[PDB]
Write a protein that binds this ligand. Structure first.
Ligand SMILES: COc1cc(Cc2cnc(N)nc2N)cc(OC)c1OC
Ligand SMILES: [Cl-]
Ligand SMILES: [Cl-]
Ligand SMILES: [Cl-]
Length: 150
């Protein structure tokens, strides 16, 4: 019943948008509809297996392995009856969906290194936190966080 729109993003120092983070992203997107910007799809260069790939863009695309949406309302309709839709970037897409999003999956990475939208922390409360030190596989330390709208 109903639908929850969730943002998922890896944020470095500032709002600027690591195998462990990819596992976390895989953990929280698999078996769910996914909405991404055209540039993000280009960067990934493929469809993500195990989920419905919705690419939101003003113009169509030559890749029919994914579904192309012309507006946010079209993208949400393409999610069907899914309980939760994952909005996975990029920065323009996060801007588009922030007001409609009630959940946020954030990975904070300790790297200096296009900004994530500014949001009032007063409107969001943390419902999960987990810190991980860098190790052999991961060059940096990172913190996983899930925020839900007050
Ligand atoms: C799964 O592969 C990718 C995924 C993403 C999106 C993404 C990746 N990580 C997190 N925490 N949130 C996201 N929205 C971004 C990527 O680079 C554009 C990817 O290629 C490595
Ligand atoms: Cl698949
Ligand atoms: Cl729109
Ligand atoms: Cl902004």
């Amino acid at each position: 019943g109903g639908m929850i729109i969730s943002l998922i993003a890896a944020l470095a120092a500032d709002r600027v948008i690591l195998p462990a983070d990819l596992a976390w992203f895989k953990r929280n997107t698999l078996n769910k509809p996914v909405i991404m910007g055209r540039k993000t799809f280009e960067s990934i260069g493929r469809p993500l297996p195990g989920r419905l790939n919705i690419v939101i863009s003003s113009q169509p695309g030559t890749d029919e392995r994914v579904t192309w949406a012309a507006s946010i309302e079209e993208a949400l309709a393409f999610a069907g009856n899914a309980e939760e839709v994952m909005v996975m970037g990029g920065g323009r897409v996060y801007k588009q969906f922030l007001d409609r999003a009630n959940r946020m999956y954030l990975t904070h990475i300790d790297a200096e290194v296009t900004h994530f939208p500014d949001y009032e922390p007063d409107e969001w409360e943390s419902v999960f936190s987990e810190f991980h030190d860098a190790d052999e596989a991961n060059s940096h330390s990172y913190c996983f966080e899930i925020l839900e709208r007050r």
